[PDB]
Symmetry: D2
Subunit: 324 residues, 4 copies
C-alpha cells in the first residue's frame, strides 16, 4: 500500500513540488478527512440542508484559518460560500500560496445520502497582503487541483501537473492510499451527464447537440448514448475520470446575465485541470476553460468536460452555429 504521504515525498524528490506545496496538500487532505468523518455519521453526527452547508463551512473555515500553523504556507484563502477572499492571520507565518476551497459540492444531495464532495485549487501569490485581485489567474496557472468525494468510500483525487491520481481513505488508519495512478479518460464515450430538465432553456447549438445524442444510432452520431445526472459535479466527474464520458452545464436563458451555473475559480478551473491531466478536455462550448483570464472572483462559465473527442464534437456544434 502506497500512502499519500510517501507519494507527496516522492513528488518532492522528483522535483515536481517543493516542501511547502507538499505540506499544504497535507493540510487539505486532513481537512477532507475531517469532513469525511462528519458526513459519514449522517444524522448521528449533527451535521445532518442549508444548515448542513453552514456546518461544513464552519469545519472548513476553522481548519483553514489555522492552516499556516500546520504547514499551509498560505498567503490567502477563498471559500465558495464567501463573497471575498480572507487573509491569513499574522500570528502564524505566511507562505506563497492562494487556496480556493469549495467545502460542499453537490449541496442538494447532502440530505439524501448521495455522494457529495469538496473541490480545491491552489494558485501562487504573485511575487504581500494578497487580496481578491491576486486570485484572478487563468486555470493554467494552477499549481495543484483536486477533489475529495464522500461516497460509499472516501477518495481524494489530485493533480500537481503530472497526471491525475486517485487515493482511497483507509478508515482504520485515517490515511489516504494510492488506488489509481494516472487516471485516463477514454477519448470517446457514449455517456453524457447534463440536466435534461433545462432543455428548453439552452441555446440552439446546445439543443441540436443533445437532440443528436437522443437520436443515437438513428441520427448523425451513429451510436446510442446513455445518461446520468447526479447533481454532484464531483460524482459525475469521478465517473468520467474512471470510465470516460462528458459532463455539461451550459449557459441557459433562465438567468440570461449569468454566463453559466458553475463558478470558474472554484469548480471549472480545478475540475478542468484534473480532467486535462487525465487526457480529457475542458471547454466552455467555444474556448478552453483553463485559458480564460478571470474578471471576478465569482465569475460563472459554461462547462464541457470529459472525453476529449466528445467535447470536441460539442464545441463544433457551437462554432458551426456561430459561423452560420
Amino acid at each position: 500500500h502506497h500512502m499519500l504521504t510517501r507519494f507527496l515525498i516522492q513528488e518532492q524528490h522528483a522535483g515536481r513540488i517543493n516542501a511547502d506545496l507538499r505540506q499544504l496538500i497535507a493540510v487539505v487532505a486532513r481537512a477532507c478527512t475531517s469532513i469525511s468523518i462528519a458526513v459519514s455519521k449522517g444524522a448521528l453526527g449533527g451535521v445532518l440542508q442549508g444548515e448542513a452547508q453552514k456546518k461544513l463551512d464552519v469545519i472548513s473555515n476553522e481548519i483553514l484559518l489555522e492552516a499556516n500553523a500546520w504547514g499551509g504556507h498560505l498567503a490567502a484563502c477563498a471559500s465558495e460560500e464567501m463573497d471575498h477572499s480572507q487573509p491569513v492571520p499574522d500570528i502564524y507565518p505566511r507562505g506563497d500560496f492562494l487556496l480556493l476551497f469549495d467545502p460542499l459540492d453537490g449541496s442538494s444531495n447532502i440530505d439524501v445520502n448521495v455522494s457529495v464532495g469538496t473541490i480545491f485549487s491552489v494558485l501562487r501569490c504573485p511575487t504581500e497582503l494578497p487580496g481578491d485581485d491576486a486570485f484572478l489567474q487563468p486555470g493554467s496557472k494552477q499549481i495543484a487541483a483536486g477533489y475529495c468525494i464522500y461516497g460509499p468510500s472516501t477518495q481524494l483525487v489530485l493533480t500537481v501537473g503530472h497526471g491525475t491520481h486517485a487515493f482511497t481513505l483507509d478508515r482504520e488508519k485515517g490515511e489516504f492510499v494510492l488506488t489509481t495512478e494516472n487516471m485516463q479518460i477514454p477519448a470517446a464515450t457514449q455517456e453524457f451527464a447534463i440536466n435534461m430538465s433545462n432543455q428548453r432553456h439552452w441555446e440552439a447549438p446546445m439543443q441540436a447537440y443533445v437532440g443528436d445524442l437522443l437520436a443515437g444510432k438513428e441520427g448523425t452520431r451513429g451510436k446510442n448514448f446513455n445518461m446520468r445526472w447526479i447533481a454532484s459535479m464531483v460524482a459525475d466527474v469521478h465517473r468520467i475520470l474512471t470510465r470516460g464520458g462528458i459532463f455539461i452545464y451550459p449557459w441557459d436563458k433562465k438567468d440570461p446575465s449569468k454566463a453559466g451555473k458553475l463558478r470558474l475559480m472554484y469548480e471549472a478551473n480545478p475540475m478542468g485541470l484534473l480532467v486535462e491531466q487525465a487526457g480529457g478536455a475542458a471547454w466552455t462550448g467555444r474556448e478552453r476553460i483553463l485559458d480564460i483570464q478571470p474578471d471576478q472572483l465569482h465569475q460563472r462559465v459554461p462547462v464541457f468536460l470529459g472525453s476529449r473527442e466528445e467535447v470536441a464534437e460539442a464545441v463544433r456544434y457551437h462554432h458551426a452555429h456561430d459561423n452560420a
Copy 2:
C-alpha cells in the same frame, strides 16, 4: 438513541410482527452491515464490475445460507442473480418465510463511488419444499420489505406494514439507529427521475408526459421541473422518500418483448411497498404494482413511483391514450 434491535422488539410487543420475522430482519440487517463494510473499503478491501457483483453475491449467499442457524426461519431464498430460488439446508430448522434478495442495486455505479444498495422482500410460504412457484405472490402479500443504501452514510429503510422507517448505521457500534420514523412522501413534487437518453424509445403517452415536464411553466403543468438520474434505484427512491419526487422506468421499444427494465419481485414490489407505506403511489403507468399476480420469478414491469399526485398525473396520460 433508538436501536434497531429495540425497535423490532417493540414491533413484536405491539403485535405487528412475531419473533420469527424480527429475527429474520436481524439476519438481513447484519448481512447489509457486512456489505456496507466491504463497499466502504473500496479498492482497499475487496469489492473493487461483474467481479464486484459476484463478490457481493458470495458475501450475501454465505450469510443467507446459514440464516436458519441464527433465526432466519427461511424456507427458501431467491437472489436476483440466480435464475431460480434455492431451498434452505435441512441441517438447520426450517421456517415459514420466503426471502427475495437483490444484493447489488445500481451495479453500473459500483466502481465510481456513487451510492448503491441492497433490496429485500419477505413473503410467507404457503402452508412444504417450496419452489419458484411459491414465490409468485402479489406485492400486497409481502410481510416485510426494505433496502440498505450504501452512501456517505449507510442507511437501512424498512417496512413491516406500519409505515416506512429509516435507520442510520452507527459505525462505531456496528448497529442501526432509528433516524427517521414514519417517512412521508409529499403528495406533489417538482422533481422527476427518469433516464432521458431513452426518450425516443418510449410510447406516446410517456413522451407526452415528459414533454410537458420539460415545458414546465410554459406548458399545461404550470410549474417547472428539475431532474436527477443516478441509475441506482435505491438512491433515487431514497431521495423521494426523503423529499418527494417521481421515479420512472417505463416500457420502451429497445427490447419489445420485455414489459420493462425493473423486476417485479426483486425491485418493484419491495420498493413499491416502502413507497406506499410512506404515502406514495406505485403504478405501472396503468395499474397498481402491488396487485399484479406475477407469472414468473423474473417478470419485468414498468415502474412509476413516488409523490402520489404526480404518479396519478402520469397514469392519466396513459389511460387517456388508451381511450383515444
Copy 3:
C-alpha cells in the same frame, strides 16, 4: 480468517454443543463487544469508579435481559454485583440455561487504563422457575465458560469442554476471529502472580511456598522466579494461558471468616475450567476447585491456577503442613 460464528457452528456439527448453547454464546459475545466499545472510549464515551462498574452492569443487564429474544435460551441470570439471581422474562421463550456473569473483573483498574475483563459461566438448569439454589453446582458441571479481556486488543477466550480457544475482535468487522486454537499452558513455569502485600496474612505453608520462590536458585527450587500482579484476574490468567505461570489468591487472616477473596461461582470455576481445558490445574491449595459443591451463590474460595506442576508444588506445601 476463522470467524467465531463459523467456529460455533462447527462445534454443533461435531455434537459438542447444541443450537441453543451456540446462540447463547453469541449473545454473550455480542454483549462483550458492546462493553469493549464503551471501555475503548475511556472518558470520552461514558464508562469513565463505582459509577464505571454501574454503567457496565447497566449495559450488561440490558442486553442479557433481552437475551431470550435473540436465542439466549436462559432460565435465569446471576450477576456478581447482585445478591441473588434474576429470572428471565416470561414474555420471551424460556430455555434450559443458567448464566453467571461478572461484567467487570479488575474493577480497581477501570480508571487507570490497565486491561480489565468480563467473566461468564454457563450451567444447565435441572429438569421450573429456577432460583439461587439451582445455581449451586460444581464447576465440573459447567457447559461453557469464558472471559473477554479488554486490553490494547479485545480478545474472547472460551471453552465448551473441548479445549480453550482465543478469538481476537476485528474492530472493522465487529466480529471475533480465531487467533489461538487449543491454548496450552506449559506444565512448568518460572512466573508467579500473587499479591505480595498480603504476605504477613498468609498461613504458614503459603509463606514457605513463596519464601522458596524468592530464594530461587539459592533455595530448594533451583530456579529463579519472576512475578507480576495486575489485580485484574483476567489479565493474569490470560498471561498464563499464553505462556504459563501460576496465579494465587489464597486464604488470608485479614477477614478470617472469609474462605478466600475470589468467588467460586463467578470467578474460580469458569477460570478453572478454561485453565484445565488448557492442560493447567485449578486447586484451592488442598483440593480440586471444580469438584467443590457450593453452599451459597457468593461463596469465596482460595485459588491456585496455572501450570500444573507448579500448582502441584503449591499443593504439596499445604498437604505437608496439614500432615506435620
Copy 4:
C-alpha cells in the same frame, strides 16, 4: 471537546512553546496513533515477542526519519533499541531538537494483551552526536508517553504541569481528558518487582519489609501493591491516583547501576511525575539533576507520591550514615 491541536496552539500563544516544538509534538502524537492502531489489531494485523518489538522499531524509525518533512525540527534522533543516536537526513530541513524515543515499553506484555507504551523525551541541541544528548533531565523541554490500553492515552508535559489526552478513535485525534494531573503527596500503593527481594541492598529490603508489616510495623498503615511490568502502566496509575514505583539497584548484575535507562525512561517519566507534584529520585539523589555519562546509562528509579519517595530516600540515607 478540547483537541490536542488546539491545546498545543494555546500553549504557543501563552508563550510556553514555539511553533517548532508544537509541530514536533504533533509528529510524535501521530506516530503514537499509528503504533496504537497496529497494537489494537493484535494478531490480526501482523505485529502480534522480539519480532513484535522489531516491527514497532520499524514503524517508529520510519516515521521519525521523515519527521523533518512534517515539522519535526529535529537535529538528531535516539531510539532505545539502537546503540547510538541517528542523524536526521540532509534532504529535509534540520531543526534544534534532540528526540529520544522508546517505541515499546513493557515488552514482556506485548504478547499477552496488557497495556504497553511508548516513552519520549525532547532535549534542545546546543548551537550533533551522542554526546549532544548528554544533558540532565532538568533540561528536557518536553516529555511524555502514550499508553496503549483498553483506551489509548497520551500523557504530556512541556514544563507547565502534566496533561492526559484520550484518543478519539473515530476522529483519529487526541482529546484532553485530564488537565493538571496531580499525584497525592502520600499513598498506600507501591509497585515493585517483589521477586527480586533477595537481591536488593539493605535499606531497600528494610523499606519493603516495613511496607509488608503495615499497621503492625513502623509505618502505621497497610500497603497494597501492583506489578504490571509495563512502566507506563504503573506510572499511569500513579499519575491518576498516587503510589510509588521502584526499580532499584540489585545484585544480579552488580556493574549495572539499575534496570531502567536514565535518558529514555527515568528522565522523561521523572519530569511527568515532578510536573504532577510527585518526586523522582534514585533512592539517594534527584533524578533530573544527574549529569549523564553515557547515552544508555542505567539508574535506580523511585517515582511517585513525594512523601513516600522521601520515606524511601530516608531509609537509604540512614543506612549510608549508619
